Design an enzyme around this catalytic site. Structure first.
Site, PDB file in Angstrom:
ATOM      1  N   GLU A  78     -11.224   1.101  -0.366  1.00  0.00           N
ATOM      2  CA  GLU A  78     -10.392  -0.031  -0.010  1.00  0.00           C
ATOM      3  C   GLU A  78     -11.236  -0.986   0.823  1.00  0.00           C
ATOM      4  O   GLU A  78     -12.153  -0.536   1.534  1.00  0.00           O
ATOM      5  CB  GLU A  78      -9.133   0.377   0.772  1.00  0.00           C
ATOM      6  CG  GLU A  78      -9.390   1.083   2.115  1.00  0.00           C
ATOM      7  CD  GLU A  78      -8.138   1.815   2.569  1.00  0.00           C
ATOM      8  OE1 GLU A  78      -7.097   1.128   2.687  1.00  0.00           O
ATOM      9  OE2 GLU A  78      -8.243   3.098   2.660  1.00  0.00           O
ATOM     10  N   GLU A 115      -7.164  -1.646  -3.012  1.00  0.00           N
ATOM     11  CA  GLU A 115      -7.565  -0.248  -2.914  1.00  0.00           C
ATOM     12  C   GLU A 115      -7.328   0.476  -4.247  1.00  0.00           C
ATOM     13  O   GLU A 115      -6.257   0.332  -4.854  1.00  0.00           O
ATOM     14  CB  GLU A 115      -6.730   0.420  -1.783  1.00  0.00           C
ATOM     15  CG  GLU A 115      -6.920   1.905  -1.662  1.00  0.00           C
ATOM     16  CD  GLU A 115      -6.256   2.470  -0.417  1.00  0.00           C
ATOM     17  OE1 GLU A 115      -5.175   1.926  -0.067  1.00  0.00           O
ATOM     18  OE2 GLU A 115      -6.811   3.469   0.137  1.00  0.00           O
ATOM     19  N   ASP A 129       0.850  -1.161   0.000  1.00  0.00           N
ATOM     20  CA  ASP A 129       0.000   0.000   0.000  1.00  0.00           C
ATOM     21  C   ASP A 129       0.901   1.232   0.000  1.00  0.00           C
ATOM     22  O   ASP A 129       1.573   1.498   0.977  1.00  0.00           O
ATOM     23  CB  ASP A 129      -0.990  -0.023   1.165  1.00  0.00           C
ATOM     24  CG  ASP A 129      -2.033   1.059   1.135  1.00  0.00           C
ATOM     25  OD1 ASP A 129      -1.898   1.954   0.352  1.00  0.00           O
ATOM     26  OD2 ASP A 129      -3.013   1.015   1.991  1.00  0.00           O
ATOM     27  N   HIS A 157      -6.588  11.736   4.803  1.00  0.00           N
ATOM     28  CA  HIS A 157      -7.876  11.420   5.430  1.00  0.00           C
ATOM     29  C   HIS A 157      -8.627  12.736   5.588  1.00  0.00           C
ATOM     30  O   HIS A 157      -8.427  13.435   6.591  1.00  0.00           O
ATOM     31  CB  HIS A 157      -7.762  10.667   6.779  1.00  0.00           C
ATOM     32  CG  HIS A 157      -9.120  10.231   7.268  1.00  0.00           C
ATOM     33  ND1 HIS A 157     -10.322  10.593   6.625  1.00  0.00           N
ATOM     34  CD2 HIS A 157      -9.473   9.485   8.362  1.00  0.00           C
ATOM     35  CE1 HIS A 157     -11.360  10.078   7.275  1.00  0.00           C
ATOM     36  NE2 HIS A 157     -10.849   9.403   8.398  1.00  0.00           N
ATOM     37  N   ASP A 183      -3.762   6.914  -3.412  1.00  0.00           N
ATOM     38  CA  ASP A 183      -3.770   5.882  -2.395  1.00  0.00           C
ATOM     39  C   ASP A 183      -4.258   4.586  -3.079  1.00  0.00           C
ATOM     40  O   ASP A 183      -5.442   4.472  -3.452  1.00  0.00           O
ATOM     41  CB  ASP A 183      -4.699   6.275  -1.247  1.00  0.00           C
ATOM     42  CG  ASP A 183      -4.646   5.450   0.019  1.00  0.00           C
ATOM     43  OD1 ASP A 183      -3.940   4.412   0.075  1.00  0.00           O
ATOM     44  OD2 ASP A 183      -5.271   5.881   1.001  1.00  0.00           O
ATOM     45  N   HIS A 232     -11.799   6.186   2.763  1.00  0.00           N
ATOM     46  CA  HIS A 232     -11.732   7.585   3.216  1.00  0.00           C
ATOM     47  C   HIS A 232     -11.717   8.532   2.056  1.00  0.00           C
ATOM     48  O   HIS A 232     -11.078   8.247   1.061  1.00  0.00           O
ATOM     49  CB  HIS A 232     -10.525   7.829   4.123  1.00  0.00           C
ATOM     50  CG  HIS A 232      -9.220   7.352   3.550  1.00  0.00           C
ATOM     51  ND1 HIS A 232      -8.369   8.150   2.824  1.00  0.00           N
ATOM     52  CD2 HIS A 232      -8.692   6.086   3.552  1.00  0.00           C
ATOM     53  CE1 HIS A 232      -7.302   7.443   2.474  1.00  0.00           C
ATOM     54  NE2 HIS A 232      -7.562   6.169   2.806  1.00  0.00           N
TER      55      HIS A 232
HETATM   56  C1  LIG Z   1      -3.582   4.089   6.605  1.00  0.00           C
HETATM   57  C2  LIG Z   1      -5.067   3.852   6.453  1.00  0.00           C
HETATM   58  O1  LIG Z   1      -5.254   4.205   5.086  1.00  0.00           O
HETATM   59  C3  LIG Z   1      -5.490   2.389   6.660  1.00  0.00           C
HETATM   60  C4  LIG Z   1      -7.013   2.211   6.495  1.00  0.00           C
HETATM   61  C5  LIG Z   1      -7.793   3.183   7.385  1.00  0.00           C
HETATM   62  O2  LIG Z   1      -7.530   2.817   8.758  1.00  0.00           O
HETATM   63  C6  LIG Z   1      -8.598   2.847   9.601  1.00  0.00           C
HETATM   64  O3  LIG Z   1      -9.760   2.864   9.234  1.00  0.00           O
HETATM   65  N1  LIG Z   1      -8.139   2.817  10.857  1.00  0.00           N
HETATM   66  C7  LIG Z   1      -9.013   2.760  12.014  1.00  0.00           C
HETATM   67  C8  LIG Z   1      -8.526   1.709  12.981  1.00  0.00           C
HETATM   68  C9  LIG Z   1      -9.375   1.730  14.260  1.00  0.00           C
HETATM   69  C10 LIG Z   1      -9.459   3.129  14.878  1.00  0.00           C
HETATM   70  N2  LIG Z   1     -10.356   3.118  16.087  1.00  0.00           N
HETATM   71  C11 LIG Z   1      -9.982   4.149  13.881  1.00  0.00           C
HETATM   72  C12 LIG Z   1      -9.088   4.163  12.629  1.00  0.00           C
HETATM   73  C13 LIG Z   1      -7.355   4.616   7.148  1.00  0.00           C
HETATM   74  O4  LIG Z   1      -8.122   5.502   7.956  1.00  0.00           O
HETATM   75  C14 LIG Z   1      -9.311   5.960   7.304  1.00  0.00           C
HETATM   76  C15 LIG Z   1      -5.857   4.813   7.371  1.00  0.00           C
HETATM   77  C16 LIG Z   1      -5.492   6.329   7.212  1.00  0.00           C
HETATM   78  C17 LIG Z   1      -6.095   7.108   6.076  1.00  0.00           C
HETATM   79  O5  LIG Z   1      -5.595   6.887   8.568  1.00  0.00           O
HETATM   80  C18 LIG Z   1      -4.762   7.553   7.631  1.00  0.00           C
HETATM   81  C19 LIG Z   1      -3.342   7.829   7.872  1.00  0.00           C
HETATM   82  C20 LIG Z   1      -2.447   7.519   6.719  1.00  0.00           C
HETATM   83  C21 LIG Z   1      -1.289   6.918   6.882  1.00  0.00           C
HETATM   84  C22 LIG Z   1      -0.710   6.679   8.247  1.00  0.00           C
HETATM   85  C23 LIG Z   1      -0.453   6.347   5.787  1.00  0.00           C
HETATM   86 MN   LIG Z   2      -6.597   4.385   1.962  1.00  0.00          MN
HETATM   87 MN   LIG Z   3      -3.784   2.825   1.277  1.00  0.00          MN
END
Ligand SMILES: *C[C@@]1(O)CC[C@@H](OC(=O)N[C@H]2CC[C@H](N)CC2)[C@@H](OC)[C@@H]1[C@@]1(C)O[C@H]1CC=C(C)C
Ligand SMILES: [Mn+2]
Ligand SMILES: [Mn+2]
Ligand SMILES: *C[C@@]1(O)CC[C@@H](OC(=O)N[C@H]2CC[C@H](N)CC2)[C@@H](OC)[C@@H]1[C@@]1(C)O[C@H]1CC=C(C)C
Ligand SMILES: [Mn+2]
Ligand SMILES: [Mn+2]
Lengths: 368, 369
Positions: B255, B350, B142, B230, B153, B222
């Site tokens: 994704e 994704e 990823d 995000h 992404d 997201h």
């Molecule tokens: C990195 C990311 O894209 C992975 C998928 C998404 O992760 C989540 O949904 N995480 C949850 C886990 C449980 C928690 N209580 C709430 C969050 C995504 O989030 C929508 C992740 C992402 C976009 O957070 C970003 C940060 C990006 C990076 C660290 C690369």
């Molecule tokens: Mn993503």
């Molecule tokens: Mn990703």
């Protein structure tokens, strides 16, 4: 932080999905009069407890959802709403807080809202025009699960103060049952304790004095994974079974008090159903019956459901198919359970875990 | 000007007129009333609104073409016996060349994820990680690219053992289903419903055991904004997620994650990933080392995600206490690896989509996935 109205899932409210513990209690003495205060700091038991933490934490998630939903409900429920509107609003919130996903997380059973002389297992079906009234006594009994770890937990809603002493009596009885539960405790001894508390209350309503009666053919019950009724019954009268509660079991401890005869019978239209566990692959001839069973398998499994829940999935003309599944032994109906017309019934209920080191009232709140 | 093998020509030089390839373009799904969305295709008003943002779409498309070329290259060499550090460095060296890395003008949108096995998301090696990729590993690659903060992404799952084939099929189908369900005015939880219906429909037999494929209920897709991976809306992969509607002109990462385990992730292992928060704009800083670390983050990453290996290569050392400080101050957030239960298997696919006025563009689509 949670929204108002609640919309944020419990799983996103807690760092690393570690959820709040309920009330933890030392075990009460067994029949021999011995305390198990050793459990509390036993290293064997501390380890055994930690080994199922994944399970207890899932119960906690479902319990936290229960607390938030019921406080929300407690903020808007009022006379003049339809029972349908009540259940829909509650259930909408539950689905969001549990972040429902088929059989992985969701509503454990239909929202009970049993009124007045009806003690249990009423939820509206389509077309029910019943309205909640000022002088109603409404038992809100609803459930959540994570991975089939079920919370069964209930309280009584009123708006007229004349019912206050009835609610006090049943709340006391339920809290007594919860206090008397523990590892190696005989089920009959819990029932005896509940009855002696319940029957110590007399209530005066509309110029008539009533002896508060335990509803003698209603029971609490053990809980298993996806199995709301795991096969041990918790009596609420004296003279139940000498079977012991055991380490690692989960119980719904509930009591029902009545101003009526103190006994329930089947009454009014059925809303609740549930697929039977034991039953194997009983053969099915008709398309509509096969289809309904597929919808039940996909959406409910062995969890309880209601007619409204089939409607909302786009199912129609399914009642003879549902009857067919009942006749074949695949599903059981659970009709509303009612004392005599004009009587008043109240309920309080928690789910308790018999963890190796303590008793946890996982569904306990600041409310009840 | 044609691409080398290994790839070395920047995308901006490969298409010297500066017009980059479109992704897959699709008509929107019918509205909930059952009516076609095909009028958007030929609407003069929608064509004009679309063309007013062509600069933006075109920057996403350069990023997407880089992503396609990088991942094709990765698939040509990735194999057991390589370290995770080797994999990530080799991927990242190519990505940097193809995107024509320059500060925040063009670059790497976020660290190279290579989450293994039960870990679903947010693992990249730190310095000293001796982890080696194994024949039996299931690895989620990823990685992201950007041009002027227009982020791609986009992710896939790498395996070598055929026993995972059905899990990979479920998750890809689920992702493709989600992409198809997406559109303007669609509720996010309805995309989640379509996805969950596809995952539910798969079972996989691995190591003699049969498992129901579960969506990872606590992970989401997201919305994406400029330098903002995000942007505040989540795309659930279950029914029980948010009811909020998608809107015209948004950009989503669609994704899905499938699991043989509990279907839920927890934090595990060393944290590698970090990112500066968007609004924390004058939270004052007293320690010099902390203020310097922030300056370096500001210059090199801004609000884009980074990892510890990317501070190391900037010649920063002895910074963990200062990074913890920025975390404790709420300026930066850590994103620890997210892992289902020991012994469980997780897969991901994704894509980035553009909810353009005239059509839905699956900008990062390739011939691979
Ligand atoms: C990195 C990311 O894209 C992975 C998928 C998404 O992760 C989540 O949904 N995480 C949850 C886990 C449980 C928690 N209580 C709430 C969050 C995504 O989030 C929508 C992740 C992402 C976009 O957070 C970003 C940060 C990006 C990076 C660290 C690369
Ligand atoms: Mn993503
Ligand atoms: Mn990703
Ligand atoms: C719904 C339920 O929890 C209500 C309390 C318990 O009901 C009884 O004790 N039921 C009966 C038994 C037969 C008799 N003729 C009249 C009273 C409890 O059972 C112990 C009920 C429960 C768990 O059976 C379930 C199914 C669950 C639901 C339908 C929601
Ligand atoms: Mn109950
Ligand atoms: Mn019960």
């Amino acid at each position: 932080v949670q929204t108002d109205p609640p919309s944020v899932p419990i799983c996103d409210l807690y760092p690393n999905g570690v959820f709040p513990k309920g009330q933890e209690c030392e075990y009460p003495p067994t029949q021999d009069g011995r305390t198990a205060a050793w459990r509390t700091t036993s290293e064997e038991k501390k380890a055994l407890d930690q080994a199922s933490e994944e399970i207890w934490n899932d119960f906690r998630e479902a319990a936290e959802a229960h607390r938030q939903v019921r406080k929300y409900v407690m903020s808007w429920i009022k006379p003049g709403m339809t029972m349908i509107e009540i259940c829909e609003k509650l259930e909408d919130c539950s689905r969001k807080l549990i972040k429902e996903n088929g059989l992985n997380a969701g509503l454990a059973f239909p929202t009970g809202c049993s009124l007045n002389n009806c003690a249990a297992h009423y939820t509206p079906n389509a077309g029910d025009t019943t309205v909640l009234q000022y002088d109603d006594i409404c038992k809100i009994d609803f459930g959540t699960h994570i991975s089939g770890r079920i919370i069964d937990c209930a309280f009584t809603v009123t708006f007229n103060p004349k019912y206050d002493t009835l609610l006090k009596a049943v709340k006391d009885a339920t809290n007594t049952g919860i206090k008397c539960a523990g590892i190696d405790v005989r089920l009959c001894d819990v029932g005896e304790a509940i009855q002696e508390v319940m029957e110590s209350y007399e209530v005066e309503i509309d110029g008539k004095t009533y002896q508060v009666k335990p509803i003698r053919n209603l029971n609490g019950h053990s809980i298993g994974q996806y199995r709301i009724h795991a096969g041990k019954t918790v009596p609420i009268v004296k003279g139940g079974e000498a079977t012991r509660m055991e380490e690692g079991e989960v119980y719904a401890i509930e009591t029902f008090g009545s101003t009526g005869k103190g006994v329930v019978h089947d009454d009014m239209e059925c809303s609740h159903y549930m697929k039977n566990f034991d039953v194997g692959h009983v053969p099915i001839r008709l398309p509509r019956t096969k289809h309904l069973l597929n919808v039940i398998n996909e959406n409910f499994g062995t969890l309880a459901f209601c007619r409204r829940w089939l409607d909302r999935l786009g199912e129609s003309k399914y009642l003879m198919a549902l009857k067919n599944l009942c006749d074949l032994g695949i599903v059981d109906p659970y009709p509303p359970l009612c004392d005599i017309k004009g009587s008043y019934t109240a309920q309080f209920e928690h789910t308790i875990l018999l963890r190796p080191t303590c008793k946890e009232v996982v569904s306990r709140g600041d409310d009840y």
